[PDB]
Amino acid sequence: MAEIGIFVGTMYGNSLLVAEEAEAILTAQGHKATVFEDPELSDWLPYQDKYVLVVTSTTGQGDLPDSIVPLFQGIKDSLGFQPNLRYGVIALGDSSYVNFCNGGKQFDALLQEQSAQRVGEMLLIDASENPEPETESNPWVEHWGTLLS
Numbered sequence: 245m246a247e248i249g250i251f252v253g254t255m256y257g258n259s260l261l262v263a264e265e266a267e268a269i270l271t272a273q274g275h276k277a278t279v280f281e282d283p284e285l286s287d288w289l290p291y292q293d294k295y296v297l298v299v300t301s302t303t304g305q306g307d308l309p310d311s312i313v314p315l316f317q318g319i320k321d322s323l324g325f326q327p328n329l330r331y332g333v334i335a336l337g338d339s340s341y342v343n344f345c346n347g348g349k350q351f352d353a354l355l356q357e358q359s360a361q362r363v364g365e366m367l368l369i370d371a372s373e374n375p376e377p378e379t380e381s382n383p384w385v386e387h388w389g390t391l392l393s
């Protein structure tokens with residue numbers, strides 16, 4: 245039975261709420277999930293022989309949240325290649341602007357630039373018109389969790 249590192253990138257907690265639901269769903273299906281609200285390469289590392297998943301957002305001029313910048317730089321510069329990494333991605337932000345989920349999209353790109361192999365398609369939550377993001381992400385995690393071991 246699989247184990248899932250559930251790495252988070254936020255400055256306001258809305259993507260973190262979805263990550264806590266994602267951990268609960270995978271745990272209920274039977275997989276040993278673990279959510280990380282303040283992650284590091286040291287917590288990403290234990291899952292390269294396994295599976296991982298991302299729940300992230302956007303900040304500044306369209307940059308990654310500072311809570312996941314040290315994970316994004318760490319994997320980019322001190323890991324470099326991941327041909328056997330398997331995962332899934334949820335991204336969350338405001339639809340009112342051109343950088344729609346651009347910080348979460350950069351974290352999916354962190355893994356495709358390293359030859360990882362996602363077990364699904366990236367979910368894009370529009371918080372400014374979607375005040376119940378659980379309803380946009382729970383059936384997505386329940387589905388993705390059937391594609392594990």
Ligand SMILES: Cc1cc2nc3c(=O)[nH]c(=O)nc-3n(C[C@H](O)[C@H](O)[C@H](O)COP(=O)(O)O)c2cc1C
Binds near residue numbers: 253254256259339
């Ligand atoms: C400076 C700034 C600009 C933002 N502009 C965007 C944007 O262009 N695209 C987007 O998807 N999210 C954007 N966001 C994210 C919003 O804050 C959004 O309301 C989000 O849901 C906040 O919750 P989160 O951090 O948990 O995701 C921006 C955040 C900040 C700090």
